[PDB]
């Protein structure tokens, strides 16, 4: 069985874009792959977090994984900072990553624009720690949304570069990007993707949004000024309507069967809202159960970090041995 690894930041409440781009695939892959899923709190602090909100968001993210169907008896689930090997491989991989590879990254430039007062070395080094997360587990396949394609390309290049110097230390990982829902767009600015960290909460549908909020947010989503108004797919010219179709389509898997609903944008918006909320209520029932069982959350983190540590330590010893470090005395 190939190995699957993927992560999400506790930087906010997971969104429907997180669900369609990543989490839905994570759940689907649990029988055909040895799946390892991580709450990457070390990545989350590359953007300034209130300390209380970060601890809460870590546990919220864990309960949301569980609520979406990530099964701790099938998959390893763990918190990144609980496994020191991630930071240790992160440093070693820095020494095999070109500065130019990092400065050219779309996320670094975009987040630097968004956080001009906190352009820190963690933001720059983000893809290297990502590569470390992935390569530690001899990962074959990495289910992510479209925005992480470039980062995953670096992970592939780093694995191959290190292997060329030292032998077959790493597996070379490949992305798994879904054909629908890989880049869900912001409701009030459909030219930019939906991001859980957005200060403007109305761009985003969180997985825990009650039915009234969903109606309100979807009703106000930016749509085009065509005359007459019809539901057609043109990302360059009907970005908002196209994103609303993508959301409903990747929620019900039909495509042009909805394109054949030839009504007004308010009919689409009422349907998206009802459909989206029907999904959440099932998820939300499991969440409110998992989130308030602290003993269960602690057991899942404990068991998951122990499982991850066994694999991560094996790869890291091999890396340290290859590089030339004196082994830690036992």
Ligand X SMILES: Nc1ncnc2c1ncn2[C@@H]1O[C@H](COP(=O)(O)OP(=O)(O)OP(=O)(O)O)[C@@H](O)[C@H]1O
Binding residues for L-tryptophan: 133
Q: Is 209 in the site for its own copies (CB under 8 A)?
A: no
111 labelled catalytic: yes
Q: Which of 13, 21, 27, 156 binds ligand X (CB under 6 A)?
A: 21
DSSP secondary structure string for all residues of 43-82: HHTTS---HHHHHHHHHHHHHHHHHHT--TTTSEEEEGGG
Which one among 7, 17, 21, 90 touches its own copies, defined by CB under 8 A? 90
Give every strand in the sheet of 141-143, ordered side by side. Answer: 76-79, 34-39, 3-8, 141-143, 174-176
Least distance from C-beta 7 to ligand X, angstroms?
7
Q: Residue 35: beta bridge partners?
A: 4
Torsional class of 266: left (φ above 0), alpha (ψ -120 to 50), beta (otherwise):
alpha
Instruction: Sketch the per residue contact string, 193 through 222, with ligand X: x for CB under 6 A, - otherwise.
Output: xxxxx-------------------------
Q: Do 58 and 79 form a contact (C-beta atoms < 8 A)?
A: yes
Contact (CB, 8 A) for 143 and 171: no
Residue 9 interacting with ligand 9E0 (CB under 6 A) = yes
Concatenated DSSP letters for 221-261?
------SS------TTT-HHHHHHHHHHHHHH--SHHHHT-
- Which pair of tokens denotes residue 311? 């694999």
Cβ proximity of 45 and 174 under 8 Å: no
Query: Torsions phi, psi of 210, nearest 5?
Result: -70, 160
Query: What tokens appear for 102 in the block?
Result: 């990092």
Please identify which of the residues 171, 196, 238, 269 carries the catalytic annotation. 196
Nearer to its own copies, 218 or 305 (CB): 305
Smallest separation (angstroms) from its own copies to the CB of 189: 27
Chain-centre distance of CA 101, in angstroms?
Answer: 22
The residue among 123 and 184 lying less far from its own copies, judged by its C-beta, is: 123
- DSSP at 147: G
Residue pair 142/4 in contact by the 8 Å Cβ criterion? yes
- Judged by CB under 6 A, which stretch of 11-19, 270-278, 282-290, 306-314 contacts ligand X? 11-19
Residue 308 is a binding residue for ligand 9E0 (CB under 6 A): no
CB of 324 to its own copies, least distance (A): 3
261 is known as an active-site residue: no
Site string for ligand X, 145-174 (x = CB under 6 A): x-xx--------------------------
E strand or H helix that includes residue 136:
none
Question: Does residue 51 belong to the site contacting its own copies (CB under 8 A)?
Answer: yes
| Interaction of residue 15 with ligand X, rule CB under 6 A | yes
What residues contact 313, with CB distance under 8 A and at least 6 apart?
Answer: 85
Interface pick for ligand X out of 4, 17, 59, 280 (rule CB under 6 A): 17
Q: Check if 53 is active-site.
A: no
Give the number of other Cβ atoms within 10 Å of residue 43's Cβ: 24
Q: Identify which of residues 17 and 316 has a Cβ nearer to ligand X in the complex.
A: 17
The enclosing H or E element of 37 equals strand 34-39
Q: Which of 74, 82, 192, 232 binds its own copies (CB under 8 A)?
A: 82
| Selected catalytic residue, list 53, 109, 193, 328 | 193
Residue number with CB closer to ligand X (58 or 97): 58
Binding flag, residue 119, its own copies (CB under 8 A): yes
Binding residues: 9-11, 17-18, 133, 145-147, 184, 193-197
Summarize as ranges the residues that interact with ligand X (CB under 6 A): 8-9, 11-12, 15, 17-18, 20-22, 144-145, 147-148, 182-184, 193-197
Residues that bind ligand 9E0 (CB under 6 A): 5-9, 40, 43, 130, 133-134, 142, 144, 148
Q: Catalytic amino acids?
A: 111, 193, 196
């Amino acid at each position: 069985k190939p190995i699957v690894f993927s992560g999400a930041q506790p930087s906010g409440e997971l969104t429907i874009g997180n669900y369609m781009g990543a989490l839905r695939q994570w759940v689907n892959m649990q029988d055909d792959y040895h799946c390892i899923y991580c709450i990457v709190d070390q990545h989350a602090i590359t953007v300034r977090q209130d300390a209380q909100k970060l601890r809460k968001a870590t546990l919220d993210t864990l309960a949301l994984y569980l609520a979406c169907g990530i099964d701790p008896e099938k998959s390893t689930i763990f918190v990144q900072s609980h496994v020191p090997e991630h930071a240790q491989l992160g440093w070693a991989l820095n020494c095999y990553t070109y500065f130019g590879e990092l400065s050219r990254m779309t996320q670094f430039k975009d987040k630097s624009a968004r956080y001009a007062e906190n352009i820190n070395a963690g933001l720059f080094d983000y893809p290297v720690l990502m590569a470390a997360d992935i390569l530690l587990y001899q990962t074959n396949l990495v289910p992510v949304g479209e925005d992480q394609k470039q980062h995953l390309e670096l992970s592939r290049d780093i694995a191959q570069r290190f292997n060329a110097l030292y032998g077959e230390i790493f597996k070379v990982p490949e992305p798994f990007i879904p054909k629908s829902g890989a880049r869900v767009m912001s409701l009030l600015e459909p030219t930019k993707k939906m991001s859980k960290s957005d200060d403007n909460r109305n761009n985003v549908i969180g997985l825990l949004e009650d039915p009234k909020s969903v109606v309100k947010k979807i009703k106000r989503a930016v749509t085009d000024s065509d005359e007459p108004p019809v539901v057609r797919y043109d990302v360059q010219n009907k970005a908002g309507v196209s994103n609303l179709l993508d959301i409903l389509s990747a929620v019900t898997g039909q495509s042009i069967p909805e394109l054949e609903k030839q009504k007004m944008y308010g009919h689409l918006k009422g349907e998206v809202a009802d459909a989206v909320s029907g999904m959440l209520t099932e998820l939300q029932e499991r969440y409110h159960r998992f989130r308030n069982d602290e003993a269960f959350l602690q057991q899942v983190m404990k068991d998951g970090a122990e499982k991850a540590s066994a694999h991560a330590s094996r790869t890291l010893k091999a890396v340290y041995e290859a590089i030339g470090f004196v082994a830690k005395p036992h």
